[PDB]
Amino acid sequence: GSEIFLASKRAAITYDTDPATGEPRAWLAPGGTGNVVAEQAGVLNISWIASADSEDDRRASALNPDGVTMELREILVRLIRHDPAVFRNVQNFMTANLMWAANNYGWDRWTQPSFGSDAREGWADFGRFTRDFADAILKSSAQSADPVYLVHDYQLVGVPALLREQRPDAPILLFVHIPWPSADYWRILPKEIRTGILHGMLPATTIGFFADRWCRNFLESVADLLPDARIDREAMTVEWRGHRTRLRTMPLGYSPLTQLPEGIEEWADGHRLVVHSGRTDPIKNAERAVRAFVLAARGGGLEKTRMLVRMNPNRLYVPANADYVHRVETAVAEANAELGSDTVRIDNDNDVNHTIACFRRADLLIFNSTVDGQNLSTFEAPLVNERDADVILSETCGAAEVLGEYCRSVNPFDLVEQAEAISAALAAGPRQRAEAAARRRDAARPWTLEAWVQAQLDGLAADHAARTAT
Amino acid sequence: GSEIFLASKRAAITYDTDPATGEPRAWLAPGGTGNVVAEQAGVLNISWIASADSEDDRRASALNPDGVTMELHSGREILVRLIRHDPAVFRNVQNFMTANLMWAANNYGWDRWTQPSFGSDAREGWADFGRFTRDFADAILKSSAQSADPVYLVHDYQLVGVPALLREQRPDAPILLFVHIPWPSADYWRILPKEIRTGILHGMLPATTIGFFADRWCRNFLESVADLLPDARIDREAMTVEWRGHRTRLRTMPLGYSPLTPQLPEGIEEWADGHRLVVHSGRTDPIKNAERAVRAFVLAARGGGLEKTRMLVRMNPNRLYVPANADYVHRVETAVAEANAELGSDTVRIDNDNDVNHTIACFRRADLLIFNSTVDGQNLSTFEAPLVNERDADVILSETCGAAEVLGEYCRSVNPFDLVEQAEAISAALAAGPRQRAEAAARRRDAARPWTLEAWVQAQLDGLAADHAART
Ligand SMILES: Nc1nc2c(ncn2[C@@H]2O[C@H](COP(=O)(O)OP(=O)(O)O)[C@@H](O)[C@H]2O)c(=O)[nH]1
Ligand SMILES: Nc1nc2c(ncn2[C@@H]2O[C@H](COP(=O)(O)OP(=O)(O)O)[C@@H](O)[C@H]2O)c(=O)[nH]1
Ligand SMILES: O=P(O)(O)OC[C@H]1C[C@H](N[C@H]2C=C(CO)[C@@H](O)[C@H](O)[C@H]2O)[C@H](O)[C@@H](O)[C@@H]1O
Ligand SMILES: O=P(O)(O)OC[C@H]1C[C@H](N[C@H]2C=C(CO)[C@@H](O)[C@H](O)[C@H]2O)[C@H](O)[C@@H](O)[C@@H]1O
Ligand SMILES: [Cl-]
Ligand SMILES: [Cl-]
């Protein structure tokens, strides 16, 4: 019976009042990673450590600082109250202003970025935030004789080294949900950050990414920057200062637990509907999707076709995100002016059910990200689509390593190639689409949240034996 | 006695009239690669094929289509054959090869999030590029038709397509392709449209030897090959590619400077007198990073100790018609204007003119040299400047110049994107005492001195000879 300790920046919690009693209710969101882990047979018990980012979180933390047991089987939820100034700066450190641009290829080098004092301060703040997490995690696991640590996502990259210092023999997995960039791009970052982040990650027993390309890039970055590290590209390992680290690819597609926005159905009725969906993040590439649709339309055959750009607002305070929405609006305005009024609409709202409705209704799905750690939407959409919609998928999504063969895989920067794919996908007959969609669904279906959790547990257990042995 | 055939986009030629007779003169520029090659002991004779890009070049080609026997000292003659491309094709290819396309691709100018977005303009550019490549191959083969065992040396990126076409006609010839600019990471290389990112690799790989100035570029190339050609096999240790029966060797052959390498630009000396002089020099190309140099200088000044210090931004105008170059000059001007407004009038000057002698004078006069490129294929300036500097100037060198693989230890190596690190290096370099600078400069000069044009040519000939045996 392993005692599991899960850490991630955000723990999904729902705060409300009972409709009958009016009593205040805090209750964990269904299908959460912690909930799934709670279920593997091996697991005796689990605690979950995350950041308090809301007033409610804050209150709950003060209220139960050691933590609160949450019934589901039970998982102990411990929220961290960071210093507010530090927490916010770290949030800006993790945004397209810094680390998001670094792992998601947002910088052109010729003009950006130019690191100043702000970068040094952001890094200092990042160390303090990392220390909070490590301390909360260790404290939470103090009684445990054999704690298993699962650290999730980029914000926590510094945590493994600090865990390892206090717990030299613990299984530590770090899972990164976003890409890792080429060695030349990774080293854009200031010296203390580009080496310092590698110092924090490498003491993990296992580092996981969604895609092989990300493991390869990671290993090249290590090789490039730490002259004392030894990488093995075949074995996927790093040996560094007596640290042996295993890199693993553990793809995720979707959670088995997965109506239209106002006026969309009637607006779409009588037309084929091209759907592009993603957060208001420049990587999602909706501007280029729209320009590509416009080029396809010029080719003809698209007269009864409409396009919906479905966006979920996120991080709009970040200039790059705001500017992306501005570029999307511009391209959509210009598409209408040329093609005809109301050919293209944006529907920008945070309602996951609406988006799923868009997925079902689509006659063509476009997930053409400039880059993407994985992209779960491209697994969800074909699985719920009832129209035998083709999928246009960018070759730079991690998901392309699993589904690329089953989709129209495109260079997300080539408007011509993407236009041609849109024309071909729409020209394709019902029987051909129907058969391709069934192949597509079968390729997507196995990659479930649960298999992903199992992959982590097994891969960790196995890497722990190896590390223990060498 | 090997018969050598050299190809490059441009062949440095001087057109003028004899000052005594008034007769028209065309003579090869001294210190040229072709001139150097002709001097090697192995070489029996050499021809040089290049593009006509001037009206003079054009008239010369029409008058001597087969070629022209240009004269060298020591009674060594190099045959020079200029190609008259179709003008429309030639100009578009110039645009393809401009930051508008291929330059941004090998020199990391694209943010991915907003640029680039390839259109029909790229497809046409590629078609034009095939036609330009076919002209070169035809001129080169024709020029070598009589030769029993022609040795082909193909220089620079514009000719990347040439080796495959040479190999088709001449399956057993030694073919070297030397690329003078960086090769980008696999993920960045594959930004380019499918027919370009694979088609360029198809063009290069049949060469016997592919050379770059730096190991990083060879590694990136190999990763690109591995990423895009599932039928290729790479060997990172051996530095080789095997692809469709083609065995290709990658080599790093660093170049520093030509031993053949004055006075300051008007008013620079008096303006600089009484002050320590920070010098940054490069073409008006965004990779040269002068904007960031200036911002870093400003941050250094805020720290104090720089009160008697001035900065000169020496630029050589080039490709100003390309928007990214014009915009770079615009960002530089802005930063220089803002530096003056904050630090004091005339603290920083730009001197932007095409006069190599002026730049060399700037190198001699500098109390601190800054070559902080965002990326560079090599950067010869960083080798030339220390070698002529009389002031024991420190050198701030970007870790992303190919030259950093030879000189990085002997310079203040910096991340070109970190204004803070670069400001600190400027303060430290200027704070350093005369004895420390003197000793560092002598070690710097010793590290730079061996990397001559001639050694580089010899490296190509030997490396090719050796790779030809292996491939054979
Ligand atoms: N909260 C919210 N989630 C959404 C909305 N639309 C889609 N989603 C989903 O959020 C996830 C998006 O993840 P993914 O495609 O991997 O891209 P990511 O945003 O970079 O992590 C998927 O599970 C989608 O179902 C929305 O409007 N609101
Ligand atoms: N024509 C010309 N050449 C210059 C001038 N200033 C410097 N140079 C030379 O041009 C070369 C610059 O090459 P390098 O630093 O390798 O950068 P590149 O411009 O990217 O190839 C050096 O040989 C310089 O000495 C100038 O004003 N005009
Ligand atoms: O909550 P935010 O506004 O900070 O951003 C939403 C998520 C985006 C990013 N999602 C990733 C996760 C996943 C799925 O786990 C991948 O499919 C995505 O490609 C990748 O962008 C990021 O990694 C997460 O930490 C963020 O919470
Ligand atoms: O075409 P131009 O003259 O506007 O550009 C000047 C040169 C810049 C570039 N010079 C390279 C040569 C060298 C040395 O030959 C490297 O040191 C530089 O880093 C690299 O930028 C390019 O490769 C050449 O083809 C160009 O002629
Ligand atoms: Cl890169
Ligand atoms: Cl990259």
Numbering used by the authors:
A (entry chain B): 3 to 74, 78 to 263, 270 to 481
B (entry chain A): 3 to 263, 269 to 479
What does the published report state?
Our comparative bioinformatics studies suggest that among those reported as glycosyltransferases are also pseudo-glycosyltransferases (such as VldE, EC 2.x.x.x), which do not recognize sugars as substrates but rather catalyze the formation of non-glycosidic C-N bonds in the biosynthesis of C7N-aminocyclitol-containing natural products such as acarbose and validamycin A. Validoxylamine A is generated through the dephosphorylation of validoxylamine A 7′-phosphate by VldH while validoxylamine A 7′-phosphate (VDO) results from a condensation of GDP-valienol and validamine 7-phosphate (both are pseudo-sugars) by the pseudo-glycosyltransferase, VldE. Similar to OtsA, VldE is comprised of two Rossman β/α/β domains which are oriented in a GT-B configuration. As was described in a recent crystallographic study of ValL, a VldE homolog from S. hygroscopicus subsp. jinganggensis, VldE is a homodimer.
The first crystallographic structure of VldE in complex with the entirety of its products, VDO and GDP, was elucidated. Surprisingly, the structure of VldE in complex with the entirety of its products (VldE•GDP•VDO), GDP and VDO was also in an open conformation and a comparison to the VldE•GDP model showed that the binding of VDO also did not have an effect of the global conformation of VldE (RMSD Cα = 0.262 Å). The hydroxyls of the donated cyclitol make numerous interactions with the backbone amides of VldE at residues Gly384, Gln385, Asn386, and Leu387. The donated cyclitol also makes interactions with the side-chains of residues His182 and Asp383. Also conserved is the interaction of the β-phosphate with the formerly bound carbon of the donated cyclitol. Asp158 swings 62–83° towards the catalytic center in recognition of the hydroxyls of the acceptor cyclitol. Upon the binding of the phosphorylated acceptor group, the guanidine moiety of Arg326 enters into an interaction with the phosphate oxygens. This interaction allows Tyr159 to swing 110–112° to make an interaction with Arg326. Within the VldE•GDP•VDO model, Arg326 and Asn325 interact with the phosphorylated cyclitol and most likely help to ensure the proper position of validamine 7-phosphate for catalysis. Despite the conservation of the interactions between the catalytic site and VDO, there is no observed conformational closing of the catalytic site upon the binding of the acceptor cyclitol as was witnessed in structural studies of OtsA.
